[PDB]
C-alpha cells in the first residue's frame, strides 16, 4: 500500500477509525522540538502558544480520499518541503499539536 495507508495504520491513527488529515515530519525529533523556541505565531484557534519553523522541513501530508471509509481507509500522499507550525506546552516546553504547514 501507499506510505500514508501504511504509516497511518502502523502509527495507530487508522486501526480504529479513518482520520481525515495527518502530517508526518521527516526531521529528527530534536529538530522538531527545537521549533518551540522559534517564531511565535497565533494558532488557528486564537491561542498564542504556536511556533513556526524558520526553515522548510520535509513533510508528507496524508489526506483521505472522498470515498474512504473504515475499515478500508484510503489516502492521498503529498510530499513537500514546508515550514511547520506546532502548538507547544509543558515543562519541558514541547510540541503537543501539529497546527499547519506553510
Amino acid at each position: 500500500s501507499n506510505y500514508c495507508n501504511q504509516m497511518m495504520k502502523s502509527r495507530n491513527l487508522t486501526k480504529d477509525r479513518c482520520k481525515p488529515v495527518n502530517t508526518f515530519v521527516h526531521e529528527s525529533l530534536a529538530d522538531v522540538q527545537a521549533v518551540c523556541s522559534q517564531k511565535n505565531v497565533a494558532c488557528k484557534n486564537g491561542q498564542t502558544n504556536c511556533y513556526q519553523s524558520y526553515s522548510t522541513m520535509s513533510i508528507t501530508d496524508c489526506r483521505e480520499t472522498g470515498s474512504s471509509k473504515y475499515p478500508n481507509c484510503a489516502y492521498k500522499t503529498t510530499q513537500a518541503n514546508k515550514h511547520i507550525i506546532v502548538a507547544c506546552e509543558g515543562n519541558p516546553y514541547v510540541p503537543v499539536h501539529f497546527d499547519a504547514s506553510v
Binding site: R11, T60, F98
Partner: peptide, 15 residues
C-alpha cells in the same frame, strides 16, 4: 495514559 507530547510524536514524527 499517553501524554499529549507522546501522542504528537507517534502521530507526526518519521525521522
Amino acid at each position: 495514559k499517553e501524554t499529549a507530547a507522546a501522542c504528537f510524536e507517534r502521530c507526526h514524527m518519521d525521522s
